[PDB]
Symmetry: D2
Subunit: 333 residues, 4 copies
């Protein structure tokens, strides 16, 4: 097995660890949170409104978070150089805080002693390896990897299947995103985007997403052909991606439906999923599937011009994929 | 002035009348609601959660709804043939219930004595005259007219400006619609669409919209080049339309921004509006503008391939446009 | 085991059956829904936004809803006299539609052939037997029983413990109820209460609840000392009951906390539950506990004057209690 | 007139100034916000989701926020000693940030040059003068005053009328509060209360309120007889206070209804308001009334034991009362 440390007990950090203990694929040896105390950690992990209550035992004995009978060392260090990652015997360390995206900031964890650092947020400098798309391009030499973003994680598997099968000359993506921690409850002062400062509960917030531009990085051919936008709506856990694209080769919508289905049942299993049911966002809650294609929703004007709909549990699916990344990395080692 | 009767005191009916007394353009002589009593009518009209409280006096004296000093005759007849529209001295009658879209059903109001019937819901057989697009094609001979739909009312003015200026080879529309009366509070049995039966508060409901196909009717050239889909999200009053289209002639996004601005300040005034501010859905609440273009949100991949964002207050903007339709019809007479 | 038929596939009906197959205590032989088709039934049962997705297999073979390998006969009869309850071999039949509360209406199911009828809605004429309070007063002679209401089911166990231990001279209850099917998404015409017609998402609806007056029926001593009111807020699944009462004998809040805890761990187990954690409504979602006391929230002005807070999953907890009722009734037989 | 400076452009600060320019009672000469730039200030003031769009002109010329033709000096100073209140010619300064509640912190504004400081948050040391209850006890000698809290502002006028008329031996208050800035959109780390860290949209948060204990300060007789609790629900702007109290002298509910009505139409006008309509929270949005009694909702078990319901627009009503306070203070001078 691979021992994994987590930096930050945020939404991503909490769910990365929940997925790890559930899946079982990686054993979480250590968690570092500058501000969250051990007693608070038990509370946060035990109860999640979006994802139900953690099943298993979370307890706080002798400074150790004992989840499912496994004690986790807890660190309270603001700067990653200070964190004793090597002493915690953590092979891989997942940067989740998100304030350390740049590879230099990531390498502070490396001096701690972590053999490799994984970034749960898109990083420009770091190479990005979305699972099921470009994961097999990973090599042992790389020590800092990014898992891109939840939106990109959803988009790319669908893009990989459609682009290979029919070709995509050009594409535009609209994402109906779910509320994030960034969005304030009522109108509030967000200096960067005045758009997000506005309250989440009563508004519909149009924001800019680089996820399509990140898919262009992970899938080389597609680069420069995908850009997008996002709407933040008052939904707690699940979001939907919509790719309006002009194919290179003609395609009937039932052909599009078939190729996705074939991919879902074959190599993109778990990474991609195909549902014909009359599904809604709630049905996709607590999903493992990074991307789930909906067949009914998408409407195609022409064989060439098609709209594709794919629902992703942003918080859960991404976190499960991070765990999968690390398991794959360990196998490559 | 023109005396206008309203059929149905539903969301559309209530706001059509609020707009009428506010704008002042049409005087509402009569309202018919099979199920809503006069005392209830005062309550419903006086307080609207989405649109604030009606300003003015709504009272119930001698069987008359006296709004702003004007008494409105009230009818309780389920079938429109039974309604005494002629006795109420109503020139124009606005079908709002929506169960009488077909022109035959509409003509029952005509026997009542209404010179013309207007349908606030899209009707296949009836000719559809969206204001500011094909309104000038109205002739005195026609007695049954439809104002199409809120979604189509938003789409078409934007489509009229872009298509004329740059051309549109093909287009696909995604609408983040606001909650409707159709959507149940919690999971409920909707036989037609299993999708809508699902609860509005916690879900994101992907539905099918014929509004793009209706724009193709109102603007002839565009017919067969626009189709779409809609997502129902938990937002009370305002929705956003997104047109991803491939232009025929190249266009820089700043050129697109200019032509819309020119149109907004010139002939499509009120019908269309251009805002560069960092707006959100709430800002567009209680708007008169059937369509309001947002410049910041839309992102263009290529000069040819562009995404256009336009926000519409579905309940208010449409209702104001219905009033405008009738005023235009009266002038033509 | 006891074979149980369900009338109505509404929120209560769906969850009564989910609880039955999960708990395992009663085997659901038959379901009758005048309007819901078998194919729709599979959909509704499989996906619930409030309660996650049903775990197990729900399928539709040969006119039978096969849930977890057990086929359920399906009936489409509007009037209960017409339903073949005896042919379905159903011993107990749960009226859930709620339009048949009166015992005469209930007895139509009895002619169908159901030995006993259970009403999931409070019924005046029928005797009401809340589980864990007056359940042991059930006798074989009675054929029509009511399980009261979710609100009463929460209130009474707490009332039973406090009243016995310290006495309650007088009490007033405020319930922050969760959204119901009755509440319209946007302002709508509800003739009975103008209050509920108003939209659920944006409003806070003060309604009147007879649950406190029903507790007075189930616990005789308390009768005439409890009345209440309810606020409908935009929360999907869980509600909280608040009993402000003046004790007869002095009580320190830590004494109140102890007696409830003792009751929860002893005879009122499952029926009542005590939590000291910093819980919120989401934590109580998908709960079996009809009433869960929160120790932290309640504040006592004097030893005599105390405020007690208890959270109940209205949809799930009640449904589980209905199953428990029937199991108890079968044992008594 | 009195020239008033505002410290902090938060929800309270923005609405205190909106009320000031609308009412007209105080002229806002200066606003200080350490983090909010002038351009951002125009945006925040112009658009408010909860309160509609500001009516009038807000512009940014020569470093001055020109609202309705009046230029407001803008300061960017974190510490109040540094702020040039005297240079801004501001007689009264409203502390709104809330981090400077203690009178020492308040006196830093005093050295700036502000003759008097007003605290929009409850302050222990500062004397608290709720309008319409103890306002006439204000004297010129006092330089630091607090306007208590929105919850206390609602409670006390109702308490003043009921206590005087019938007497209140003891009282307990439950407030269904609306979402605040404190409540995070999704589960988040709030160290002080683990309860509030939980997400506002999906939860119902039981918190502790000292407002009842503050009413005991403003009305001396009542001190020690009122305590309470609050539930944070997902409603954007309006909340409801519920006082369950045992009167000293008998009272029929229609007598309670009368005395409140008499008070509303007489001395507690604007401060208190009585409505018999079937009102809901939305109806009270953008209200000036600090407290509005609802007659229908409250239910009385006995003449002695009564439940009283009063709805308050927390953000708007309080802010208007702050303006009224200062006008009263100026008159006393």
């Amino acid at each position: 097995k691979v021992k994994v440390g987590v930096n930050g007990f945020g939404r991503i950090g909490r769910l990365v660890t929940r997925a790890a203990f559930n899946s079982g694929k990686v054993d979480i040896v250590a968690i570092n949170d500058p501000f969250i105390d051990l007693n608070y950690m038990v509370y946060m992990f035990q109860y999640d409104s979006t994802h139900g209550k953690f099943h298993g035992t979370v307890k706080a004995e002798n400074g150790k978070l004992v989840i499912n009978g496994n004690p986790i060392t807890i660190f309270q260090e603001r700067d990653p150089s200070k964190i004793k990652w090597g002493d915690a015997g953590a092979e891989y360390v997942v940067e989740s805080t998100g304030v350390f995206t740049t590879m230099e900031k990531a390498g502070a964890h490396l001096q701690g002693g972590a053999k490799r650092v994984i970034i749960s947020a898109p990083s420009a400098d770091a190479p990005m390896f979305v699972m099921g798309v470009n994961h097999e391009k990973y090599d042992n030499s790389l020590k800092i990897i990014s898992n891109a973003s939840c939106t990109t994680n959803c988009l790319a598997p669908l893009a990989k299947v459609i682009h290979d099968n029919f070709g995509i000359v050009e594409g535009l993506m609209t994402t109906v995103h779910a509320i994030t921690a960034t969005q304030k409850t009522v109108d509030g002062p967000s200096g960067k985007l005045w758009r997000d400062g506005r309250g989440a509960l009563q508004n519909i917030i149009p924001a800019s997403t680089g996820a399509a531009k990140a898919v262009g990085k992970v899938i080389p051919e597609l680069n420069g052909k995908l850009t997008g936008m996002a709407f933040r709506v008052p939904t707690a856990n699940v979001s939907v991606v919509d790719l309006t694209c002009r194919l290179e080769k003609p395609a009937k919508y039932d052909d599009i439906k078939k190729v996705v289905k074939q991919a879902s049942e074959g190599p993109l299993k778990g990474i991609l999923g195909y549902t014909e049911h009359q599904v809604v966002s709630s049905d996709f809650n607590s999903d493992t599937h990074s991307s789930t294609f909906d067949a009914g929703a998408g409407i195609a004007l022409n064989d060439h011009f098609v709209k594709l709909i794919s629902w992703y549990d942003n918080e859960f699916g991404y976190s499960n994929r991070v765990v999968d990344l690390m398991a794959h990395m360990a196998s490559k080692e």
